[PDB]
Design a protein around this ligand. Structure first.
Ligand SMILES: *[C@@H]1O[C@H](CO)[C@@H](O[C@@H]2O[C@H](CO)[C@@H](O[C@@H]3O[C@H](CO)[C@@H](O)[C@H](O)[C@@H]3O)[C@H](O)[C@H]2NC(C)=O)[C@H](O)[C@H]1NC(C)=O
Ligand code: SWH
Ligand code: CA
Ligand code: ZN
Ligand code: ZN
Length: 758
């Protein structure tokens, strides 16, 4: 029942025997002698010139005796003060090609240095403010910024880094949450958070343990100081080969605490940032002292940013809502409403009431698809998006975080230093869901199913272990020739520049050729899955004639039993039709007749037509003149169950009144051109440029408060909000793009993960 020769033990003991680990403090199960044996304060954490050459006393924190090197308990500045050597930061920058680890090391260890609320723009401060951080940034691999996950809070973000999944999948959807099945509530302060029922998926420490790789403790008790944490890691690295782990983690509550109080632009922010660098300095000098400085791989990462938020700028529900006393709300930078009733009337009372209104109400299903925040029992149906610098409350500090993940102030940091990372290079910004696959590859582990694209971060490391491959095509297409119904009317490698998309599921479809476009018509869903066309900068927009307004002509390649009809839309009081290829952008008046075919017809509400027509008539040509030619691929999306994955025929819930024509939930479009704007889209030499969208198929424009005004005032702003990656479209459609290219497959995977933020 003592902690003698058991301090910070990797194995968990009891019950009922008292524990001597770095987690016992939170569970309140440590021995009485734990505080005396394991935690030592005496004579500080710094070795002085007058302390050099001393006799070992078993009461002091860190030792300054000659016999400390053989043990592994010297102070961080022992070799600098006593031996008379230089600090790691003062030494010149030298290349690390091969890991300089001692004999007996199977794999080079990884240390994760996570900092709370470190805004990406703090790095812009001088080298004299943060000298140890500026060396790691300039010598190793670094990115200007890193995108966090929504909500931009501590708990959903840190657990995302450890699993590689979205919060809707891992279970931790926020710092404060309620589960209807368990009938219990998860909070920041309480003993409920300690239960294993809330935490899902497979974290990094389990993945290592299951594959015969020893993993140290990730969670630290609040009472354990920053200096003692750095000392414990350096003590664990001196243990024998059969005892010492291969992965360690460090956590810091700052600069988040001093950021919430003073604000991101406050002059008081300089000093807490200086202490962070001092802790980094202690670790690097410690690694140099143990001669492990050219062996270990180190990561400096964050979780979210910081924005100027005050008491004066707050929106109250009592100024909008009917009762308010009968409801429950998760307040602050986001809003979630539930009962203690009709949700139809609650949204209606919150829609564009005040002119300068600083919040938008949503149903979890109608949120921008890029957020990935709906499919979970813990996520409330009524959701509220809050504007930057603002707060939301039920009824009646200089900083806060938790807003949209595309907000500039919410962006975080990333620095990769070690023998596996690239030397003196800079990489473009990436998303935090991609880290789990890199950490797994750095330790030589097989990752569990996660939401990352394996191979998209291969440009970061000098020596890659994983090589990505293309998925095989499941369904092969048909090439039909030639062979009522209420409808009346009075080179092909130029349109598909990057190869035809492959179908990854069991279906029956056929390819169709036209002078201005090319498509993949599905006989199961009676409409195409995609349509490809190219528009140059020289091209001009043509007007839609009067005699060809209600013109729909039958297709001779497709059977009448596997095609749409004009009678279905005539009988449907709420539905109308549109076209995937714009008739406005035709080569000749004869070629305009191809655009009005029944195989190019798609179901669209009259309210959505305002958005789709402005994009086709005005916006497409605008992009072609700026980007020097563009390549467009557009089609439909069905996602009723809101799981972000392609719906089966049994999962379709809406059809055109009296028929078997399905109604899409969303409409996608991919715009590709050459990265070198001096070159045209059809004559590209090197890399490409991309921008995509996932527009919702809504029967009203209530999302746009200025929808009463002309299209040139509200349309483009809506498209920017509903921006998406190529990978997002791929999950909702089951298609695989960019097949035939003169580029590397790794370059394609990076392009498929790009998000245009504007
Ligand atoms: C992001 O990644 C997660 C994990 O890889 C994806 O979730 C997994 O997908 C399926 C369907 O949602 C889940 O259930 C499975 O269903 C079949 C039905 O035939 C059944 O045999 C099993 O019950 C099977 O497990 C699976 O449990 C689930 N895992 C987790 C942890 O959620 C998710 O769909 C991805 N999101 C994207 C790509 O947007
Ligand atoms: B934030 O909103 O600014 C915020 C909210 C609450 C708090 C409360 O204080 C703590 C203190 C410690 C921790 C530690 C955690 S949470 C977690 O998942 N892990 C495990 C881990 C995952 C990934 C990783 F890289 C390292 C560790 C912890 O150790 C949370 C909140 C503070 C800030
Ligand atoms: Ca689905
Ligand atoms: Zn945080
Ligand atoms: Zn915080």
């Amino acid at each position: 029942g003592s902690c003698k020769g058991r301090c910070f033990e990797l194995q968990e003991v009891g019950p009922p025997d008292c524990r001597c680990d770095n987690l016992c403090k939170s569970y309140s199960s440590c021995c009485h002698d734990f505080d005396e044996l394991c935690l030592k304060t005496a004579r500080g954490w710094e070795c002085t010139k007058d302390r050099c050459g001393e006799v070992r006393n078993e009461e002091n924190a860190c030792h300054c005796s000659e016999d400390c090197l053989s043990r592994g308990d010297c102070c961080t500045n022992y070799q600098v003060v006593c031996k008379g050597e230089s600090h790691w930061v003062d030494d010149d920058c030298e290349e690390i090609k091969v890991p300089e680890c001692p004999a007996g090391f199977v794999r080079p260890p990884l240390i994760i240095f996570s900092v709370d609320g470190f805004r990406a723009s703090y790095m812009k401060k001088g080298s004299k403010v943060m000298p140890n951080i500026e060396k790691l940034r300039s010598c190793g691999t670094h990115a200007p910024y890193m995108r966090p996950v929504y909500p931009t809070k501590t708990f959903p973000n840190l657990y995302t880094l450890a699993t590689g999944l979205y919060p809707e999948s891992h279970g931790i959807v926020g710092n404060s949450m309620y589960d209807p099945v368990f009938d219990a509530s998860f909070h920041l302060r309480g003993r409920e958070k300690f239960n294993h029922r809330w935490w899902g998926g497979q974290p990094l420490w389990i993945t290592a343990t299951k594959q015969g790789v020893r993993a140290g403790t990730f969670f630290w008790s609040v009472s354990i100081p920053h200096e003692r944490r750095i000392l414990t890691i350096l003590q664990w690295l001196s243990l024998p080969d059969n005892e010492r782990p291969s992965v360690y983690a460090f956590y810091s509550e700052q600069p988040d605490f001093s950021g919430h109080k003073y604000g991101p632009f406050g002059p008081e922010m300089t000093n807490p940032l200086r202490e962070i660098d001092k802790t980094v300095g202690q670790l690097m000098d410690g690694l140099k002292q143990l001669r492990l400085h050219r062996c270990v791989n180190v990561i400096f990462v964050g979780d979210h940013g910081m924005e100027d938020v005050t008491c004066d700028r707050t929106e109250f529900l009592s100024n909008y809502l009917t009762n308010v006393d009968d409801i429950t709300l998760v307040p602050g930078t986001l809003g979630r409403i539930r009962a203690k009733y009709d949700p139809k009337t609650i949204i209606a009372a919150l829609t564009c009431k005040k002119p300068d209104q600083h919040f938008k109400p949503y149903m979890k299903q109608h949120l921008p698809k890029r957020l990935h925040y709906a499919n979970n029992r813990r996520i409330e149906d009524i959701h509220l998006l809050v504007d930057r610098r603002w707060h939301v409350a039920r009824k009646p500090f200089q900083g806060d975080h938790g807003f949209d993940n595309k907000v500039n102030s919410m962006q975080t940091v990333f620095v990769g230093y070690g023998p596996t990372f690239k030397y003196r290079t800079k990489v473009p910004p990436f998303e935090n869901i991609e880290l789990y696959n890199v950490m797994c590859d750095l330790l030589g582990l097989k990752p569990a199913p996660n939401n990352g694209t394996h191979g998209s971060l291969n440009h970061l490391l000098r020596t890659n272990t994983f090589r990505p491959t293309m998925p095989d095509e499941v369904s092969r297409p048909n090439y039909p020739g030639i062979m009522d119904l209420g409808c009346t009317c009075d080179t092909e490698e130029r349109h598909l520049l990057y190869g035809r998309p492959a179908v990854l599921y069991r279906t029956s479809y056929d390819i169709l050729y036209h002078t201005d476009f090319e498509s993949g018509y599905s006989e199961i869903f009676l409409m195409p899955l995609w349509t490809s066309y190219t528009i140059s900068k020289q091209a001009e927009v043509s007007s839609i004639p009067e005699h060809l307004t209600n013109c729909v002509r039958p297709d001779v390649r497709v059977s009448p039993g596997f095609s749409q009809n004009c009678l279905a839309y005539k009988n449907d009081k709420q539905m109308s039709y549109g076209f995937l290829f714009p008739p406005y952008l035709s080569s000749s008046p004869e070629a305009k007749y191809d655009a009005f075919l029944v195989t190019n017809m798609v179901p669209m509400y009259p309210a959505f037509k305002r958005v789709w027509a402005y994009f086709q008539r005005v916006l497409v040509k605008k992009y072609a003149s700026e980007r020097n030619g563009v390549n467009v691929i557009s089609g439909p999306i069905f996602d009723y169950n809101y799981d972000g994955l392609r719906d089966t025929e049994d999962e379709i819930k809406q059809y055109v009144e009296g028929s078997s024509i399905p109604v899409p939930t969303h409409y996608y479009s991919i715009i590709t051109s050459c990265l070198d704007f001096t070159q045209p889209a059809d004559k590209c030499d090197g890399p490409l440029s991309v921008s995509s969208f996932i527009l919702p198929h809504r029967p009203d424009n209530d999302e746009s408060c200025n929808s009463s005004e002309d299209e040139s005032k509200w349309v483009e702003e809506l498209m920017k909000m509903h921006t998406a990656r190529v990978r997002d479209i791929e999950h909702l459609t089951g298609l695989d793009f960019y097949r035939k290219t003169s580029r590397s497959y790794s370059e394609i995977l990076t392009l498929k993960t790009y998000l245009h933020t504007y």
